[PDB]
Structure 1
Amino acid sequence: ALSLTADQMVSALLDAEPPILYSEYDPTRPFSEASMMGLLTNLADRELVHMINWAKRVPGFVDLTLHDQVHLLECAWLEILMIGLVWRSMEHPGKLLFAPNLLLDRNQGKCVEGMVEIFDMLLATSSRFRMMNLQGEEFVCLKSIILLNSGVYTFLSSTLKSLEEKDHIHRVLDKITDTLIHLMAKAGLTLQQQHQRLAQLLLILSHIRHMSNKGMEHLYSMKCKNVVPLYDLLLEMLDAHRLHA
């Protein structure tokens, strides 16, 4: 990502995109019988495996230590799931496309206590994306910034290693800024519109953080999975051998 061109970062990120998964329920069977949170939790857990694969293809990420990769993902995984959900919901006003076979409106969120509040925030984000005409190339840049940025301030220590890690991350974020600006210039925005649009995009990331924080608060009202710490499951997933090479 540090000698990669702007055109090469954009292609690398497009190449890395995870697949769109389906909800797992029998579509020949009724709906009142379904646990909406079970459906959503099962979907999200399945996406997480693919998020790990994606993160390893973000330029610069695997040059980090395993521990720092785990930390970043532990800090950003729900933001990353949510921006992906808002992105595929963009062309579906008033609805959230959790999966191609699971498209829910706000009243379907009332089904779970405290969940309509989260739905409403997600829906508003999707509407802002649509109104901004967010582009596929801009979205993958944003998703990678979330991955690199959300946990970069909470690394405990400040060892030599740690200082080098933070420098490298800030260097990669810098190149993704250069890429976003490059995309906007290519599109024919003036200098002035570029910086304004860059700021508009980056401020949405503070809303996504808000949504992740609220969603974490909401998810922690027990019912879901909280077995084995998240660190450990992420590490297991991230700490791959190379035998299947």
Structure 2
Amino acid sequence: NSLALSLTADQMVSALLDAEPPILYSEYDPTRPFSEASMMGLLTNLADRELVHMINWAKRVPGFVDLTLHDQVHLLECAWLEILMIGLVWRSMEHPGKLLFAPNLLLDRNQGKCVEGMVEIFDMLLATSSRFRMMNLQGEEFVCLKSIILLNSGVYTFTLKSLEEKDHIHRVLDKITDTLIHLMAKAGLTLQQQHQRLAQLLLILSHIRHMSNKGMEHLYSMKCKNVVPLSDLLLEMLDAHRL
């Protein structure tokens, strides 16, 4: 018997909102001059500290604690960059043409173009926050989409006891889908508009996967370049995708 299946729609939103990680700050110094590796060093330092909060945020996600320890590791190893990217996109939603990596680090594409290869990832992140701004995404819907990424990005890459846990994950995903529809019904949307918005939101997750795959490849060349420092946890997450 699990708790994630016994949660109501409002209880699902309250649990995901209380589990929201904080907005960490960057070590950015405007006095200090700026290199291609200095900017990436700030972004990789920030992502590492955010990984510590994400690991503890995932524990408070309904159903995630009911999973095998090895199953929890697999889901995070495949979704960690997706979740970082959607969090960055969500924060940058109120800043057209800029990415809010940290409250003290707001970068436009020209500042972010100082790192080669990062220009493409930068534009895709800006286009995702533009799409969220056009749709007027709500925080109740964002925390739902982020929990969907955590549970869905690693189920198709995981015997009868192992399929019982996989069938349990899909029951939690269906609970979050019911919650998304319950949120849209309160906003006055008709039954036709709820299905369209639900489809529009889940299709964006396909783009976030594309950004994470491309972002994971650029992070790999940064390792071999060896110029930008990478933490041991960030290097473990990188070895999880290549292997």
Q: TM-score, normalised by structure 1?
A: 0.89
- Matched residue SS, 2:188: coil
Cα distance change on mapping 1:115 and 1:236 into 2, 3 Å: closer
- The alignment covers a number of residue pairs equal to 240
- Matched residue SS, 1:117: helix
The equivalent residue for 2:195 is 195
Q: How many angstroms does 1:227 deviate by?
A: 14
- Percent identity reads 100
Q: Deviations over 1:17-44 (max 9, x none)?
A: 0000000134553445970110100000
Unpaired runs of 5+ residues, structure 1, are: none
Does the CA contact (< 8 Å) of 2:28 and 2:105 recur in 1?
no
- Return 227-236 or 27-36, whichever deviates more: 227-236
| Counterparts of 1:230 and 1:77, CA distance in 2 | 15
Q: Deviations over 1:48-101 (max 9, x none)?
A: 000001000000001001000000000100000000000000000000000000
- Matched residue SS, 1:239: helix
Q: How many angstroms does 1:239 deviate by?
A: 19
Does the CA contact (< 8 Å) of 2:37 and 2:227 recur in 1?
no
Cα distance change on mapping 1:235 and 1:82 into 2, 3 Å: closer
- Matched residue SS, 1:195: helix
Cα distance change on mapping 1:80 and 1:225 into 2, 3 Å: farther
Does the CA contact (< 8 Å) of 1:70 and 1:238 recur in 2?
no
Does the CA contact (< 8 Å) of 1:70 and 1:235 recur in 2?
no
Does the CA contact (< 8 Å) of 1:74 and 1:230 recur in 2?
no
- Matched residue SS, 2:37: coil
Does the CA contact (< 8 Å) of 2:220 and 2:238 recur in 1?
no
- Return 39-48 or 217-226, whichever deviates more: 217-226
| Counterparts of 2:240 and 2:154, CA distance in 1 | 22
Divergent runs of 4+, >6 A: 224-232, 234-243
| Counterparts of 2:49 and 2:218, CA distance in 1 | 20
| Counterparts of 2:221 and 2:237, CA distance in 1 | 26
Cα distance change on mapping 1:220 and 1:241 into 2, 3 Å: closer
| Counterparts of 2:76 and 2:208, CA distance in 1 | 15
Are 2:183 and 1:183 aligned? yes
Task: Please tell me the root mean square deviation across aligned C-alpha atoms, in Å.
Answer: 4.8
- Matched residue SS, 2:235: helix
Does the CA contact (< 8 Å) of 2:36 and 2:114 recur in 1?
no
Q: Which has the higher helix share?
A: 2
The equivalent residue for 2:13 is 10
Does the CA contact (< 8 Å) of 1:148 and 1:173 recur in 2?
yes
Q: How many angstroms does 1:223 deviate by?
A: 3.9
Q: How many angstroms does 1:182 deviate by?
A: 0.2
Cα distance change on mapping 1:234 and 1:22 into 2, 3 Å: closer
| Counterparts of 1:237 and 1:219, CA distance in 2 | 10
Cα distance change on mapping 1:207 and 1:229 into 2, 3 Å: same
| Counterparts of 2:206 and 2:169, CA distance in 1 | 19
Does the CA contact (< 8 Å) of 1:23 and 1:99 recur in 2?
yes
| Counterparts of 2:230 and 2:107, CA distance in 1 | 27
| Counterparts of 1:235 and 1:2, CA distance in 2 | 35
- Matched residue SS, 2:51: helix
- Matched residue SS, 1:229: coil
- Matched residue SS, 1:34: helix
Cα distance change on mapping 1:100 and 1:241 into 2, 3 Å: closer
Q: TM-score, normalised by structure 2?
A: 0.90
| Counterparts of 2:129 and 2:68, CA distance in 1 | 34
Does the CA contact (< 8 Å) of 2:82 and 2:209 recur in 1?
yes
Cα distance change on mapping 1:215 and 1:105 into 2, 3 Å: same
| Counterparts of 1:15 and 1:53, CA distance in 2 | 12
Q: How many angstroms does 1:161 deviate by?
A: 2.2
